[PDB]
Ligand binder design. Sequence first.
Ligand SMILES: CSc1nc(Cl)c(C=O)c(Nc2ccc(S(N)(=O)=O)cc2)n1
Ligand SMILES: [Zn+2]
Length: 256
Amino acid sequence: HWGYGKHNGPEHWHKDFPIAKGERQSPVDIDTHTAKYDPSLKPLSVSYDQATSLRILNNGHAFNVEFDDSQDKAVLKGGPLDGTYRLIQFHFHWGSLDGQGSEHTVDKKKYAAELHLVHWNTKYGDFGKAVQQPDGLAVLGIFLKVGSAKPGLQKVVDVLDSIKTKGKSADFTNFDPRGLLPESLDYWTYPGSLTTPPLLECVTWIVLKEPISVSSEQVLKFRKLNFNGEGEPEELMVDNWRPAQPLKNRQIKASF
Ligand SMILES: CSc1nc(Cl)c(C=O)c(Nc2ccc(S(N)(=O)=O)cc2)n1
Ligand SMILES: [Zn+2]
């Protein structure tokens, strides 16, 4: 199966998932000087006040914090988007070292990690249907740099010991994802894809300009997770990021 190792990593994915070499793959490098300010772009509407988190799962690639998406509870609208997108899960990508881990890069700069808040377009009724549509998903990407701790991240960090290995889950109710946002909602946006198999070209990417700061201890604890299942040799869950892909025939737009 696909993963992040030398034998099953990003360079291999195209064999099972030929769309890996497609026309709108993610992530990409964001060249800040080439991104054009689009005055037609609206402010981003992030409405997470009624978010209902349920569970946290180690899926063998990262960990997902899952939400109740059976009602309009936590929704993303505005910005480049037409309509309403429901929050289904968030997860992170991170490195073995503070100098790598993000999927998107900014003028080739790699951040220590990247948070993805995954939302699906309600006009398609469910997530499975949404991923089959060019405008099916909106993923809000937020960079993490190492510095001061992010207090709103600590509840996530502290539960990781209970989901160390692939397939483990834990109850994760009453988590407020508003605590993971930076101050500014200034963003870049472009049409792209899922950054893991199946690599479907169904995502409007919205990447925030302002990173959040997390502590070295917080990211250290991400790095204690395992790709492997319980009772299997330990493979630390690190470097679970896909490199920047060719921009091809795309423009990145800036809201600012
Ligand atoms: C990771 S296993 C996996 N498998 C399947 Cl079958 C799907 C189906 O959609 C999926 N979703 C997914 C959602 C968001 C992102 S990202 N990194 O672009 O935000 C990547 C994968 N992930
Ligand atoms: Zn992701």
